[PDB]
Structure formats: C-alpha cells, structure tokens
Design an enzyme around this catalytic site. Structure first.
Site, PDB file in Angstrom:
ATOM      1  N   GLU A 266      88.909  28.421 157.172  1.00  0.00           N
ATOM      2  CA  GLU A 266      88.996  27.983 155.779  1.00  0.00           C
ATOM      3  C   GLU A 266      87.776  27.094 155.552  1.00  0.00           C
ATOM      4  O   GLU A 266      87.822  25.898 155.850  1.00  0.00           O
ATOM      5  CB  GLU A 266      90.302  27.231 155.518  1.00  0.00           C
ATOM      6  CG  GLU A 266      91.568  28.094 155.605  1.00  0.00           C
ATOM      7  CD  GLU A 266      91.914  28.764 154.291  1.00  0.00           C
ATOM      8  OE1 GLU A 266      91.148  28.611 153.307  1.00  0.00           O
ATOM      9  OE2 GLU A 266      92.963  29.446 154.250  1.00  0.00           O
ATOM     10  N   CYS A 300      87.551  21.602 148.164  1.00  0.00           N
ATOM     11  CA  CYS A 300      86.915  22.866 148.501  1.00  0.00           C
ATOM     12  C   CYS A 300      86.851  23.775 147.283  1.00  0.00           C
ATOM     13  O   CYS A 300      85.935  24.596 147.176  1.00  0.00           O
ATOM     14  CB  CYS A 300      87.631  23.550 149.658  1.00  0.00           C
ATOM     15  SG  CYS A 300      89.420  23.501 149.560  1.00  0.00           S
TER      16      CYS A 300
END
Ligand SMILES: [Cl-]
Ligand SMILES: [Cl-]
Ligand SMILES: [Cl-]
Ligand SMILES: [Cl-]
Ligand SMILES: [Mg+2]
Lengths: 509, 509, 509, 509
Positions: A266, A300
C-alpha cells in the site's frame, strides 16, 4: 520537560503510558533496543520515550507469535470473530483519549484522530460478520464419486509495517481481517508514532489476556528500518503487509519476492481531481479544498493534482483561493481547528523544496507557499497554477499540502493525464455527463484502484477493497474479498467412491 | 532427413506446418531471429524448423498487440466469449493431429497429447460462460445518495511464457481467460516445442482473421531466454504469466516486481502421496504408479515423494515393483504404449545425476535407475527406498521419473514432511479416516495449492483454480476466481445526489 | 390444403415434421389424446396436425421421466453441461428452418424467430459454464472439529408450461438451466405452437438418444388446460415453471402451493416507458416505436404505457405518428417486414374491443385502431392519447399493439404511476439526469423486475435474471443465480472429530 | 395471585413489565383488543396480562409502519446495521432476565432461554457485517455502451408471525436481517408468549427512540389467529414470514399466494436420526437423548424418528432407556434441571393421544408414556419401538417428547425412509463411512434443508441458511443468502452511450 509529566497531559496515563514505555509485546512487555523519544509536531516538545526492539527481542517475539498461532488457528473463525468484536468494544471505551494521542503525537486534528479509531472499531464489526462467511465454493466435480472443494486457511504470521500518517487505522484494517482469518500478527509501526503503537497494543493485549489467549497473537516490535528489513527478509513472516512510501515499499516487495513470501503493498499516491465544464462548482470547490488540505496534505489519498476545464479554471481557482484563506489553523487537538502541522521538520523542508521547484519550473503560487511563523511544523496550504501537467515535481508525491492546478479541454487527454503518473491510488471526476461517468469507470478510464465520481480522492469506506495500482503496489485492505490475501487457497478433490483406477493392461493384485 | 518430409509424418501439413516455419505472428507472420530445429525425443530425429523472433520482431509485435487492445477492450465481454467459443471449435476440428504433434515434438503418449487439447477446448467453453459473469459486487454505501461499485477491467497485454511439458494446455488456460477478460496476449513458448506453439497460433489466427479481428490479440514471438527476459522487463507487458522452473521463475518474478508489474507464477513441484495404514492398497498402488511414471515423470504434478505407513511399506513397494515391470515402453504415438522418452538429452543426464546423488545420500534403487539401450531419450522409471525424508536430493525437483519412498508412523509427522519442502504444488493422502481427511484439508494439514484425498497428485480439473504455494509461486489458472488475476479491481464511489459536503465553518459561494 | 403438403413449404420436413405428428415424447413418440391442427396466422391456412397427450400418456411420461432422473442425477454436472452444449450445437444446425417455423406457426418476423433460437443456443453455452460452477459455500463453523457446507441438489422433475409468444426461448431457458442442475424436464407448450414444441423436442431427443441417455430426460406432453392443470396438481412435478397470463398463472400458483410444491411464475406485463424533459428524443421515438410494435405488441415485455413530460408530449406523439405510418407490414418470413399478424382471430377481436373501451373511457386514437384490409390476422399498430393513467383499460394487459400515452410533470408522480398497476415485469426511463437514474434504480424507484435506463422495456439479456414482481409472479429465468430455483439447498454440518457431547451429569457408557 | 405481583418475581420489572401490559407498539403503546393472561407452564399460575390488538389497532399500526418505511429505506444499509448493532447490545444488557422470562412463560430450561437471547445477539452482529455487503453483481453486458447491474431493494413491510417455542430467536433472526435490508417489521408472536414479545419490543423500542427513529420500524400487534389471518390477507404486508405448524402455515401460504404477496414459511418437522452399524455408540446415545428430550421435545428440530441398524438396535435402545431414567426433571429455572414441562395442557392431551395411538398401531412403549403427577404440564419423555416406519402416527408431527425407533438393514432403504414423510426440516446420520457420508449429502441422500453427519437434528448455526423443504415450507432464515428473501431483485440495463437503435428502414426526424 516531557509532556507526559506535565499535569495537563495526565490523560496520557489513561492509555497506560509512562515516561518510558516498553516497545515490545509478545505476551510480556520489554525492549532491549534503542530508546526513542517522540515529539509533538505542533510544538516540538518531547512527549515520552519508547524502548524499541533489539534483534534478540525480534527473534523472541517471532517465535512466540508462531507458537501462539498453533493455538489461535485451532479456534473456529466465528470465535476468533468474538475476540475481534471485543477488541472493537475496547477501542470504543478509549476512543477519546486514543484519538487525542493520535492528534498529539501524529498531528492530525482531533476529529480525524477520533475518526481513525472509529474506522478501526467499524472494521472490527465488519470482520465479526466476515468471521462467519470466509471460505470458498463447493464445486461440481466432473468425476463421479468425487467432491471438489475450495478451502481457505491462514498463512500463519502476518507482519504489518505501517506509516506515520494513519497510525491506528492501517494497522487495525490489517489486524481485524488477519485475525478472523486465523493468522497471528506482528506490528512494526512508524518510529515517530511509537506511543500510538504501544497504546493500541495495550488495548488489544488486555482483551487477549482477559480471554486467556496468548498475547503474541497481536505482537509488537517497535523499531525502524532495521526491524522492517528483518521482517521483509524473514521466511517466518508468511505475509508482510507494508504501508509506506513507494521508495521503501519497492525494496520490501523485492525482498519478499526473493524468498517467495507474500506481500501486500500500500504505497504512494499522486491523486487527481478532474472538474469538467458541466460540474457543479458548489460541489467542486469544497470537495477540492477538504481533499487537498485535509490532514495538512498528509493522506495517501490527498488531492495533489486538480485538472479544471479551461472554461471554468479561473473561477474555480479564484473560489479556492477565497476558501483557503478561511482555513482555521491551530493546535490540532483544539476546538474548531481544521489545519495542524506537518509531521516532521523534514516534511517542511520537502514542502519548501517542492514549492521552490514549482516556481522555478514556471508555476505561480496563487495561495500560500511559505512556512508559518509559529511553533511546530506548520506550513501554509498551497495552490500552484501554470505548471505543465508533466512537470517533474507534479509527477512526484510531495507529502505536503501543495495542489497543482492544470487546464484541460478534452476528455481523452485529461483521462490520459490522470493515468500518466507512476502512482495509481485514487482519482475523481466531477461531471454530470452519464456517458463520461461510465467511460471513467471503464477500460479506457481511470487506471487507479479508487475511481470516484462527484466525491474527491479520499472517498473510500470499509465495505470496499482499499488500495491502488501501478507504483501504489497492488495490495488491498478491508472490504470485498481483500481477506483472501491473508489466507492460502487450496483446490481439493476428494474421491469418496470405491472406484479403482483403470488398470491400463497392467495386472494389479 | 526432416521428419516432416517423410511419408508417415505427412499429417503434420494438416496443421499448416512446413520444413521452415515463421515463429512470429502479430497479424502478419515473420521471424528474423535465429532458426531453431526441434527434434522428436523418441528417436532424436529433426522434425522441422522455426524462425524465432529478433528484438525488432518483438518490438513490432508488442506495439501491434497494444494497438489491437484498443479495439479488443471495446468489445463486450460476451462477444469476446463468442470468439473464445470459436477457438474451442477450431481446436476440436484439429484435436487428433494437434495431439499427435504434442506426442511427436514433446514426447508424451498420444492419449495425453489429445487430452491436453481437450482441456484447452473445455476451458474455452468454461470461459464462454465466464464472459457473461465476470465483474464485482454493487455494495451498499454508508453515504446517502452514493453508489459503491467494484469494477473489473482488463490489465492490457498479458504475456504468457510456457514450459515444454504442457505445450498446449498451459497457454490455452491463460489465453481463454485472458481473452474474455479483455486482454490481448503475447505467447513465448518453450523453444523445444516451437512447432506446437506455431500450430496452435495458426489455429487461433484463422479464427481471429475470420472474425475480422486484429491477429495481434493472440500474438506469438518464439524465442528463448532473450525474449522471455525482455517480456519480464517490459513495462508494456501488464501481466506476465510464467510457467516453468522455480529457478527461472524466481528471476522473472523479481524483474516484474522491480517495475511494479503483475506476475502470475506457476513454478516447480515436489509432490507427495501419503498412504496411511487404513488405505485401500488396490487404489494406492495403481494411483502411485500412474502418477509417478505418467508423462515419464515430467508433469509439474508428478508424484515424486511416496510416504507409506511402516505397517504397509514393504508390501506397497513390492507391489509397485511388480507393476513397474509391466509398464509398456515404446514410441509415444504407438497403440497401448504407456511410457515414452524424456524430453531432452540433458534431462537424461539430470536423471542419472540424481540417481547417483540418491545413492550417495544412502538410498537404494529397488527398480530402474539406468538409461534404456534404445534410440531416443528413454530412461527406466525408478524407485528409491531408504533415503531420509530431508535428504537434499529428495527436497530437489528432478524433472525425471524418480520416486523416493519413505516410511512414517504418525499423521502429524508425515503432514510436516509433506510441508517441509520448498515446493507447494500438489499433495495427496490415501485414507478412509474421516477426521484425518478433514485435518488434511485444514490449517494444520497440507500447505499445497492442490490438496487431494484418495486421488493422486495429478487430480485437478478446470472448474477449480490451479496452482501452488511457496516456491511454486502463488499464481492460479483456469477456475474459481482465477480470472481476477487478469484484471484490475477498482472501488468506485458515485455521488449522484445534489447534496453538498459540510462547509465546516468555511463560507463558500 | 395442409401447408406442409404444399411444395412452397417443403422445408418443414427438414425439422422432421409430417402431416400428422406425435405430440408425446418420453423416449417413445406417441399421443392418444385429441388431434389438433395448427394454423398459420398470416394466411389462416392449416399447417399440420399434432396428436396430443391423453391422461394415460401423461401418467406414463411422468413415470418414465422420474425413472430417467435416477440415471441423469448421477451424471456429474459438467458432463450434463456437455449434453447441453450439444443441444446448443444441434439448434445451431437447424436455426434457419426452426426460426422459419416460429415465423410460420406463431407469426413473428423471421429475424425474431431466428433470434429466439439464437437466445436458446446462447443460454446453452451459458449453462455449460454454470455446469462447472453451481454449488454453495463452505462456511466456517463455530464448532471445533466440524465442517459446515451448503449443498445444492436437483429437485427432480421440472414441469415447464410455456406461452405461445416465445415458443422456443422460454422452454430453452428453463431446459438448459434445469438440465445442468440435474433435473429432468416435462414440457407442455401452447397448443397453438404445437409444431414448434414437437420440432424442438425432435432436436433434443436426437441428442439424448445419440448420447445413450433416456429420452424422458426431456419429455414432451402436448396438451391444453387439462394437461397443464394435471401438472399443477401433480406431487411428482417437483418444480412447475409456468409462463403465461396472470389469470391462469394465479391458479397454477395456488394449486402448486396447496401441495407444497415449488412454482416459478412468469406472468403478465403492463410495461411503461417514461420520457423526461431532458430525454434524447432521437433515442426516445425509435425506442418507443420498436418496443411497442415489435412482435405486433405480443411480447410480455412490450411497451404498453408511454408517459411523456408535458413539455415534449405533443412533439413526441407527432413524431411517433409520423414513424408509425412507415411501419412495413406483410408476411413475417419476408425480410422487409417489420410487422406481422396477431396470433389468433380472437386476438384481433380483443384488439378491437380494447380500442372501443379506450374510446369509451375518453381516449383518442391518434394512429391506427382498425384491422388491416388483407388476409391473416393483421391489425394497425395503435396509439391512444387522452386516457387517464388509471383508466381500467390502461391497467389491463391487452395482448395487442396498443400504446397508451400519458402526460406527466413531476418525477415522484410518474414513478408512482409506473408502479400503480398490478403487473411488475419491465420498466424504462429516458433521461440524462444522474440522480434521477439512481433514484429510479433505488428503493423509491421502479418496482419492476427489469428496471432500464435509456433502453426500452424489451432490454434484457441472458446474463441477468429475467422476471417480474407483483402479479408477474416473482420467478426468474436464465442468468445471475436463477439456477437456485431449480435445486434444493441443504445446510450441512459434519462432525469429523472424536469429541463427545457433554454428559450433563448423566452416566453414559 | 399474579406472579409479577409477588416479591420473588420482582426481576420481571427489570424488563419493564407490570400487572397489565400494552401489547401494541407502533411508536406509541396501546391495545384495545382482548386482555390475555399468560401462565407459567411449570405450575399453571398466572404471570401477568397483555392487552392485545383490535382490528383498529392493527390498521393504525400497519399505516404507521408504512409511513416509517419512508424514512427507514432512505437510511444507508450500513447505518441501518448500526441500529441493529445497538439492538444486539441492548439485548446483551438484559440477557439474564430475558432468558429467565423465556423459562418462566415458555417453559424451556434457563440455559436455553439465555441461549435463545444469545442467538439473537449474535445474529445482530452477523447482520451488522451483512449491512455492508448486501447487493448484487455488476455484470458484463453484451451491448456496447451499456451497463448491466443487479439491484436489491427492500420489499417494504415484513410481517413476522412466530411460534411459541422459540419466542425470541425466530423473531430476532427475521428482525435483524429484515432491518438491515431496509424493511420495517410488524410482529405478531404466539399469544402464550405475549410477555416475551412485549419485553423484546420494549428493548428494541428504546433503541429506536434513543436514535430518534420512528418506533413503527419494529411494530408489535399481539394477537391470535385473527391478527395473523389479517396479516396473511393484507396487501400492505409485502413479505409474511411465518413460523408455526404446517397446518396453519399451509393456509397462510395460500392466502399470501392468492394476493401475489411473498411468504417465507418455516413449518413442521419430523426429523430422523439414522445410526449405521459402524457408528460411535458413545456418540449416538447422548446425541439421540439430548436431541429427543431437549426442550421437552418441543423444538422444530427435535429428533422424532430414530433408525438403528438391526445389528445395534437392541443395545442402543437399552442404553437409551438407562440414560432416560437419569433425566433430571423439575422447574426449568432450577440450575440442576434438564427437563421442564410441555408448553400447554393441550400439548399434554396431544401427547397422550399419540402414545395411545402408537400402541393401537402396534408400538411398544419401552420408556415413559405417562403424564407426571405434579403441578404444571409435565409428561415423561417417551420411547416407542416396534412401529412400522410408515405408521400414520410416526409420520405425524406430535409436538411432544415421543421418540419412534425403527430397525433397518441397508443404506438405500433407510435414506428412503428418512425422505418418505411430508416434513423436510432436519436429518442426521451417524457413521464413519466416507462414501456413505457424501451420498447422504448428494442427490440420492437426505431431502431435508438441514443434512447433518455425526451431530443430531438440532445441529445448526447462524452462518448457514436455516429451514426445510416439502411441508416444512421452503423458507430460510439467518445465514448464507437468506437475506435475498427480504428484498426484491431488479435486473437493470443502463444505456450510457449516444448510440441510437438501427432505424430498420424507418425515417425518423
Ligand atoms: Cl498391486
Ligand atoms: Cl465557493
Ligand atoms: Cl450409553
Ligand atoms: Cl423521430
Ligand atoms: Mg392466452
């Protein structure tokens, strides 16, 4: 001088924290590695200290976790779900002080610290349902007298390396799902959020202990690149879930592949919002503002690229400028604050360097661009116009609130400009056009893992699989069938008949 | 002296083959690389020649395949399924001569050559069904006025590198699924089965051309490690499906991971059969014989380790030896032949090397162990007793018909011995005991991708996902939801409401 | 005077049809009931005769079908799928002549007759894929040492009663799915399409017989209400799939419920198209015309109510009137014909009755309304304006090309008007408004089984479940998990452990 | 003389109960129908009174529930799940006193009353997970520029009629699932468990009111056949879930079918245990005892038929007799008690009638068969040998602890005898034979909805769909995809393209 010794921060002791904390948990608490002090990014004052894991601590903990797995994997998944349900309740009971710690040590505003714990709570409850559902199909065999079944079983030890910016919820999404799938976990959080990692582990450890289960089921080894690299190379770590930068995750992915392990990556994002000529501007402007400046640009999923149709570009920029000026700056735990500090002084340096590079590359700072003159790591949320969409700095993830604004004319070109970067996490279009919406969702549309319409780039929820493509690394967390990454599939043929194989002319007894 | 110029092999021309064949197809046929001659392993005579791909051939082909994808991805999946249905019918029309070519160029017996084409045929029909089914769930969003959808879209170009030993079906499994998923394909088969790759590609090319579709949807670039390495490094190859040795697949996996591509790895096996004391020996003995000596021990699923309970070990070994002596050896296309040659002369040398290492490490050859004194690459099917289960040679995949036999006493130890090797492809127990069967299927049971009961290690069918764990590389082919590896998931939130986000105290226009 | 005895129609013999045909098939062909002559509705000439089932025929056939089931249910589903695949190929080989028979005996245009056979062919190929997929999940039991599996097994004998207007495809959708699910079938088609039923059964019978299977797996008992009522009351008919009028289907449903059987009801429609002010009128007008006049208004999915926003009502009606005048009428097997005859003389009379009722209730015939001056059952396609949306005749399904047109202003009212009738089959809106589209698809939207956007009420395909709600009866055919209606679910707990229940203070041995 | 007015029962006030209780809740509490008194079956003393619903009460409640649905169906399913989560917590808080009430008013032992509440609690947590999962697939349309989606929406009002013997958990299974699916509920419980229905409704009403939701989302109208029949005939009751006798459920099913409503029928059982010659008798005897006498034989899943292989029949009967003699009888709240009273005096009369009928049909009472001379409705648990398996009384469900025992020899006959009755709820075999187990699970095996191995007929859990076949009515509750029964499927084609249909020779404007 430590904040934890000042009376106004005494609530920290409600999380079991002390002046010096043990950063290793495997059923027992310890830590023989280096002592780290973490600092409040709003004022640069030291909070408290954590004794990190030495190599010997890591070895001891990995072994205890893998012994604990022998017990844990024998527990029926619905009963593992009951443990996860109790973790959810235990988080609920501490949600205000844990959220406050997230605000203090990491720097996001209190409503987001609390909201992060709530997300973990809600994933626990989702996992409770999954714990009665996970499995595979029974399939019709082509062979008479045979069954064909797809089984799923835990991989074993799930190592979980997490980033500074979601110091509770990324671990929690991995923990809740890995646990109901029958795995034990080993957490190495970000060193600058070590107190959060300790606090969360104290909460889970009490649930495990109260249920007479080995605490190493949810083990903790605080440390930095040393422990993280060990996990990446360790054949005993059956799955390594890594949330962090693309630069580091690339090396982790290579190390795991070298040993034929499993990785769940991720990694970085460079997320675009696209506003077409028909967009509702009263939706676009607040959507872009909150997605760009939320968490001081340190999600993010932060919006870092804003493409606006040429016909509305100036109006949207002007409206964004007026709204940016109203952002409320303060200590992140203080009432009505919208905007806190960057996490480190190095983040401030990277911010300044990107602003400088944008200006030298022909961009105009239309709002912000400077450090704020106050304690902590505060910078102005920043809007840059006039850059080329392929400017090197626009293609870079700078983990700071810099919004690069671009003009476009046609749909095909701007879809390509969304897709042209190396990252592939989130993406959003604002439009009313039905055909454009389904093209965006189609094979010639966005190449990202999150593909949104009329909601910005942080639009995600726990029911869906969360993650990205390309240099974001391909892993998924939380919803849909993300659980399968934490288990191993087997395809199983069972001959229950008395039938013998054909002799093929050979005389058997 | 080419077999294709001899009267009894004139059937080769029914596949469109001639003395020298173009080994590149991208809509046009070509090949400017080195010319390779392939040989019949039954007699070491040359069959015909294939012009392989130069670098320029490869570059032109990748560009043409990606241009074809723009057309192919716009075709609805059910209409892509209709093309795959026609491929199935076109294979049916050629099944006998194509199966004969598999027997001639690769060396497996005719029923298995034909059977390999039949499996591709059947996967085509399965994929026709899937072409109306692939997709994701529509989920209930937590947000009022929003939809939440999981979309699946093609990855683009699927490169397919295949092994010598299933020179039709491995490609077919990847081709049929990748096609209905909206991908274009690029095939690099094993150099020693180049005529098979050309013949299959001629069949598919005619179907594409008859449907007025660009032939580069199913491109071929024959070549060796040069082309395969280029594919592993090529960012334009969105998914690389690799079937081959663990040694090569490890490097392919690293090269794809370096560029944040996707890989699907189908690597080596070291598959165990375990016979418990309650096993039906009239089932065990033929099961083990056919799974060990089938395809001259050259299946990835070949039985290479046989664990027998100490109470029945000697009886089963004696019965196996008496049955091995009845194996009928000859040309693999001749009637009633059960046992043909190894694929290469190098495989014969590897066979002899392993037998010598087995003797050094304390094993006894109780049947076979030597090269047969006849033309071609024939070796005796071989049984070795007395080795320790953790002998280095027993933990190695030697791609030859050597069966290592071990004693065991209890279930827990023998399950561990099944799992202790680095390979993780297939596994079988023979027992009547209900609890033991479900323990074998559970978290403390087999760690392989294929976990079978009372059927040996080649027990698999297209309805299930096919593949292994550990150094077998983790990829899956054919059934269940293996199709998802050929597509990219997006989690898509659609705000269809007129609702605006909360203003959070900011005054918007 | 029978058309089958005239050289112009000699192609009928390619389907195995003769002057007099057996209407019973159970492995044997027979028919001791009443002989019926079917007529061509385009010229009112007799085609050929069918001997229908007596009660004794029915009893014998049910018995043979249930005996055949003992064999059929033991055949693995993928091998049942292979039989269905061959049925698809046999239909392919007769597609032109069978489609021609549909046009001749039922009266729809040739492309729709051929298209019906093509739909059956494509359902077969769909079912071939399903035959390797049907089943249920293996679930994680809360009990240590237990497995929990959801099994699906055939219900036994599936009776299939079908309507005149889709005399091939309704049977085929039920047949293909019921067959791969392990059921045997008994067909009673509409009496007026007896030759079509016989011809389809001849094609299937040859496939079954060629595969050495008992023909009663796909049994046929031609007959009228007496045979249909017998099936509705027969405990040996495990599932009765009924396609037909709501009036008859209501009684079939009650009879099956009285005996605790299973029914699958596919009943009447009264399907609405709604055109909003923002609709693309160049899309609306042809969509409405083709959905209203297709099959001379004799589809269950025919558009019978057209709601047009008041701002565009007059324009859309004028454009429909101009286009209706261009509809080409003639023999349905001629290629320029868009529009063939109604199925019976009674249907013509009922068309005239409905037109008079619409006038009595205040409607105006703006186009059509009369019988055509030509042989055969031809009526003018008809548009009626000025009725109230709750007019009795507008709420009635009249199986004729009469389109009732209504004005509306607001979205909520017109959604309610869509929903206010007793039927609930198909529905369509034409609009560009994103929120309106998702409201239509949501809980306050259309109440029908088919809910379409910018495609009219005949928009359906085999990958989805087909059927309606309310008085349309609730059954589904073809796609998604419609197959579950043809099987029985079991939830199966398997204790594989040696554990004994707690003694609860009782002394056991 | 009311128990609730006695100090020993003051705990009833913890549930908000008093001398006379409102039995209608729709956001307001009322009841203008007849006042019913309920009695403790252990001593026939009156507990408290409930004011039941008049017709006017029912009519107002239905209207209020349907008004509440307008709000409730607009709440996102995950947020509906949050309400169900709080219902689970509120039940947890009252679990001891609510369980005690089940024991007092219904008569089952305390651990089972508490266990019933626990099942509802755990279904709530399962439903919380499902609330983020329910939906259908997005499918690949065969049409260019079209999407194809399967939507699920609430049916509206779910009426729930429940039986006396699971007065909490049956309602709870329906309530939790119907609620997360967006339905409002209307409960009519068994009149003899009216206090339980009121107590549960009080708990839920508090949750709804605390969340500022209209209380009619979970409406209550206590009454008997009058209210139940009104619900069965009421077109406003979109789904009627009925748990009760086959005799009543048949008429409910017919009334719902008459109005084209939906029913979910959970009716009678006649559940068999089969013990094969190889069974573990130390498992069989306790399994049979507890499944036959648990809840005094008043579970729908109670074992009523015991087939024993002839080789072990006498031994198992002898061991069962010795174990029955040890059953501890008394007040169902007493901690040492295994066996309480039948629910009513009429149940005692039906028990006696069945015992004397069994003797008249040739059976022998080898244990029990008499009413117990003590206060309350106590009868001896009873074992009858020597009946033919097809004796009329053995084919009848007598809701009382009578176990009919039969001999058998071969597997095929005893599977047929399991299947020959009209009921189809649960079934169990005890055997070690692998092939027999999978045959039992297959198409020639058990025809019931629950098909168990080495666990008795009450072996079920919430992760699976619960229900039966044949005269058990076909409905399912709780797990797998049972949720689809509470929603309506739509198959939705969305044309998002600018494409127009082919003009077919018509000149449009
Ligand atoms: Cl033998
Ligand atoms: Cl604004
Ligand atoms: Cl006993
Ligand atoms: Cl027009
Ligand atoms: Mg009719």
């Amino acid at each position: 001088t430590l904040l934890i010794n000042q009376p106004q921060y005494a609530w920290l002791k409600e999380l079991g924290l002390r002046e010096e904390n043990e950063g290793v948990y495997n059923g027992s608490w310890g830590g023989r590695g280096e002592v780290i002090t973490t600092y409040c990014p709003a004022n640069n004052e030291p909070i408290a200290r954590v004794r990190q894991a030495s190599v010997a601590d890591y070895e001891e903990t990995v072994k205890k976790a893998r012994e604990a797995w022998k017990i844990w994997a024998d527990i029926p998944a619905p009963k593992r779900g009951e443990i996860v349900r109790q973790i959810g309740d235990a988080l609920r009971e501490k949600i205000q002080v844990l959220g406050s710690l997230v605000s203090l040590e990491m720097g996001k505003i209190l409503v987001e610290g609390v909201g992060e714990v709530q997300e973990y709570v809600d994933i626990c409850d989702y996992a409770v349902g999954l714990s009665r559902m996970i499995g595979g199909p029974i399939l019709p065999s082509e062979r008479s007298g045979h069954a064909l079944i797809e089984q799923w079983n835990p991989v074993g030890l799930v190592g979980i390396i997490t980033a500074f910016n979601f110091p509770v919820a990324v671990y929690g999404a991995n923990n809740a799902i890995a646990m109901i799938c029958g795995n034990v976990c080993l957490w190495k959080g970000a060193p600058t959020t070590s107190l959060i990692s300790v606090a969360v582990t104290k909460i889970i450890a009490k649930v495990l202990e109260d249920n007479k289960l080995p605490g190493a089921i949810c083990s903790l080894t605080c440390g930095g690149a040393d422990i993280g690299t060990a996990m990446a190379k360790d054949e005993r770590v059956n799955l390594l879930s890594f949330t962090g930068s693309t630069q580091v995750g690339k090396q982790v992915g290579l190390m795991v592949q070298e040993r034929f392990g499993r990785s769940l990556l991720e990694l970085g994002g460079n997320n675009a919002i696209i506003a077409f000529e028909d967009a509702d501007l009263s939706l676009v402007v607040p959507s872009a503002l909150f997605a760009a400046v939320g968490t001081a640009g340190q999600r993010c999923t932060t919006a870092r690229r804003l493409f606006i149709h040429e016909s509305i570009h100036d109006e949207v920029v002007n409206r964004l400028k007026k709204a940016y000026a109203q952002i409320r700056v303060g200590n992140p735990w203080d009432p009505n604050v919208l905007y806190g500090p960057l996490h480190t002084k190095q983040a401030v340096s990277m911010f300044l360097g990107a602003v400088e590079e944008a200006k030298k590359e022909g961009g105009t700072v239309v709002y912000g661009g400077k450090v704020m003159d106050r304690p902590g790591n505060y910078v102005e949320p920043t809007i840059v116009t006039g850059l080329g969409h392929d400017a090197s700095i626009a293609h870079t993830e700078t983990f700071a609130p810099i919004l690069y604004v671009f003009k476009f004319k046609n749909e095909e070109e701007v879809f390509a400009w969304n897709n042209e970067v190396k990252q592939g996490l989130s993406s959003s279009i604002f439009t009313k056009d039905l055909g454009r919406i389904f093209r965006w969702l189609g094979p010639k549309g966005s190449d990202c893992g999150i593909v949104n319409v009329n909601i910005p780039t942080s639009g995600a929820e726990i029911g869906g699989a969360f993650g990205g493509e390309k240099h974001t690394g391909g892993g998924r967390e939380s919803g849909s069938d993300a659980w399968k990454q934490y288990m191993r599939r087997s395809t199983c043929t069972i001959n229950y008949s008395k039938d013998l194989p054909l002799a093929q002319g050979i005389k058997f007894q």
